[PDB]
From Swiss-Prot, chain C:
In plastids the minimal PEP RNA polymerase catalytic core is composed of four subunits: alpha, beta, beta', and beta''. When a (nuclear-encoded) sigma factor is associated with the core the holoenzyme is formed, which can initiate transcription. It comes from Nicotiana tabacum. It comes from the Eukaryota. This is DNA-directed RNA polymerase subunit beta''. The gene is rpoC2. Coiled coil: none annotated. Signal peptide: none annotated.
Length: 37, 157, 192, 229
């Protein structure tokens, strides 16, 4: 009825079908700094 | 004639209009560094870069006309520029706000000199065998200075 | 149009609750255009970590490449099951083996699965009580510098026990690859 | 339990411009009261066994008394019965850099002590503050960020509370001059700015403040190195 999270899960499955455990999970700024440093 | 209730309350001496009390503490809060002119500076930077890159694509068009003095349209207006368009949608459909920078607003001489120096260093680094990289342009540094002075104002406040 | 020096970082600025990225990695948005919590927007699949070999990796991962050939059921195979074939071995009428090793022929209902496990065949001794069904990977052993003729194995090898017969079993040392999750971080600068 | 600290100069014969009857009354009464009250209100509490600054920054009923004593002692120490008239050393450099001249600084101190309008202490402070909210850090930091600022504080308020560093103080409270002389405050202010201010203690405190600022800057670099390592 309200706050249905179906569309988000659907577009996430269309973008990434295999929801495997993320080997590398990090913030954007941290990744940019690691690329710099 | 009265259209603002706060002005009426101040004129008649009555108390201010009641408002719901926010639970945040103004003393302990993150400072504000974003500058209002940053958006216009970014848009004029993009317009300058685009017009300068497009003068390269059409050398005949750039020839015969000075970079400092140029006119795209005589009856161009900022009001007519603002519009909403959602016809083109690759993944998402939303209104495309259009902004038309003024001709005199852009100072094309500095952009032309900058691009000349940048492509000279680009071809030089390609002769070296490495891709040329530049950290920041002038207008971006000016925007950073605007943000810095705004942050100084907020810190002093 | 485009330029020779394409640096999208110098043309994009990030503000409070406002991210402006110049479209020219790729990104996708929903039909309505709204986003949600933990919503993936851009994809950064890097071809540097891609592999052409059929073998897939499974802090660091090991990938053992294996030559797998999917042939039809009515295809005539010129190789026998559990047979050791060398390089350039004619497996089919127009298909030749690219790597030498043990040939495994898995005959399914409507598909012929031919697998060539490349590696050195070693005969384990009596005291070599290695796991038959549990393959063990050996890393680079720190060989002592005293021994001169001790060839240092700088590459990791995957030892797999192949038991074609109930009484005779062999050990195959297949190759391995290096895939590190922590090592390797490449992402194009999006915001200045 | 803190005890009242005697002033450096002999209270009876320190300065002909401040009566010893006056000196005595003011000093004794105020210091004693603050300390005892303070000692009474901190006894059997976690605040006991700590310095005044700790207490000042923590406190509440044990605030007003502590600050006043601390301010009062600082005030006594801020002066000796000689040597007034002009500062020197790094004091002059910092004064002419920010204020522009020594006379401008004197006029600002006078026009800040005069306009307190009630019970207050005037202060000359070396501004080295570090905020704990949002983007406190300053990009492209350089000199001229730490400055000498002349601030006016209300009753029982000290600049210690806003991470400022206290260098020089005038006690603009009635007890200081009302008893001594007819109550014209500019007189007392002028005489303070003339014949009692001691610049040597101010130079020492400026040195201490620059040392604390340097230690904070080096702590920042240590934290950055720990981040890199
Ligand atoms: Fe006093």
């Amino acid at each position: 009825e309200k706050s249905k999270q179906e569309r988000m899960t659907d577009v996430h499955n269309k973008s990434i079908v295999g929801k495997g455990t993320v080997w590398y999970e990090m913030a954007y700024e941290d990744a940019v700094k690691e690329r710099m440093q | 004639e009265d259209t603002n209730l706060d002005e009426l309350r101040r004129d008649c001496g009555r108390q201010p209009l009641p408002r719901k009390d926010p639970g945040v503490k103004v003393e302990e809060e993150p400072l504000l560094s974003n500058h209002p002119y940053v958006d216009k500076l970014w848009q004029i930077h993009n317009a300058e870069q685009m017009i300068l890159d497009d003068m390269e694509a059409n050398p005949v068009k750039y020839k015969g006309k000075n970079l400092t003095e140029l006119t795209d349209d005589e009856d161009f207006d900022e009001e007519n520029r603002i519009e909403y368009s959602k016809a083109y949608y690759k993944k998402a459909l939303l209104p495309k706000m259009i902004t038309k920078v003024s001709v005199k607003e852009l100072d094309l001489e500095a952009a032309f000199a900058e691009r000349q120096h940048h492509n000279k260093l680009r071809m030089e680094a390609q002769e070296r065998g490495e891709v040329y990289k530049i950290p920041k342009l002038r207008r971006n540094i000016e925007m950073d200075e605007y943000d810095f002075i705004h942050w100084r104002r907020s810190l002093e406040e | 149009s485009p330029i020779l020096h394409e640096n999208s970082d110098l043309l994009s600025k990030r503000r409070r609750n406002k991210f402006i990225i110049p479209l020219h990695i790729s990104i996708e948005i929903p039909v309505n255009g709204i986003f949600r919590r933990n919503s993936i927007l851009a994809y950064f699949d890097d071809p540097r970590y891609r592999r052409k070999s059929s073998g897939i990796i499974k802090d660091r991962f090991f990938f053992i490449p294996e030559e797998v050939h999917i042939l039809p059921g009515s295809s005539s195979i010129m190789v026998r099951n559990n047979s050791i074939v060398g390089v350039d071995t004619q497996i089919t009428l127009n298909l030749r083996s690219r790597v030498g090793g043990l040939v495994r022929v898995e005959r399914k209902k409507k598909r012929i699965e031919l697998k060539i496990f490349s590696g050195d065949i070693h005969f384990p001794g009596e005291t070599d009580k290695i796991s038959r069904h549990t393959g063990v990977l050996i890393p680079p052993g720190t060989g002592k510098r005293n021994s001169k003729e001790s060839k240092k194995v700088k590459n990791w090898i995957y030892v797999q026990r192949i038991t074609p017969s109930k009484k005779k079993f062999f050990v195959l040392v297949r190759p391995v690859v290096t895939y590190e999750i922590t090592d390797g971080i490449n992402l194009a600068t999006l915001f200045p | 339990k803190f005890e009242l600290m005697p002033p450096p100069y002999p209270m009876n014969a320190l300065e002909p411009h401040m009566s010893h009857t006056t000196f005595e009354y003011h000093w004794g009464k105020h210091h004693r009261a603050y300390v005892d009250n303070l000692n009474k209100q901190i006894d059997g509490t976690e605040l006991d066994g700590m310095t005044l600054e700790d207490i000042i920054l923590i406190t509440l009923p044990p605030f007003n008394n502590a600050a006043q004593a601390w301010n009062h002692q600082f005030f006594w120490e801020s002066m000796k019965p000689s040597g007034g008239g002009k500062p020197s050393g790094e004091l002059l450099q910092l004064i002419n850099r920010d204020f522009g001249s020594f006379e401008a600084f004197v006029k600002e101190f006078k026009a800040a002590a005069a306009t307190q309008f009630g019970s207050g202490w005037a202060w000359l402070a070396y501004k080295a503050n570090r905020l704990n909210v949002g983007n406190t850090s300053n990009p492209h930091p350089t000199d001229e960020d730490k400055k000498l600022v002349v601030v006016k504080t209300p009753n029982a308020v000290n600049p210690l509370v806003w991470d400022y560093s206290p260098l020089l103080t005038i006690d603009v409270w009635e007890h200081a001059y009302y008893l001594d002389f007819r109550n014209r405050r500019p007189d007392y202010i002028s005489i303070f700015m003339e014949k009692l201010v001691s610049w040597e203690a101010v130079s020492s405190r400026l040195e201490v403040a620059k040392a604390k600022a340097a230690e904070r800057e080096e702590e920042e670099e240590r934290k950055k190195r720990e981040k890199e390592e």
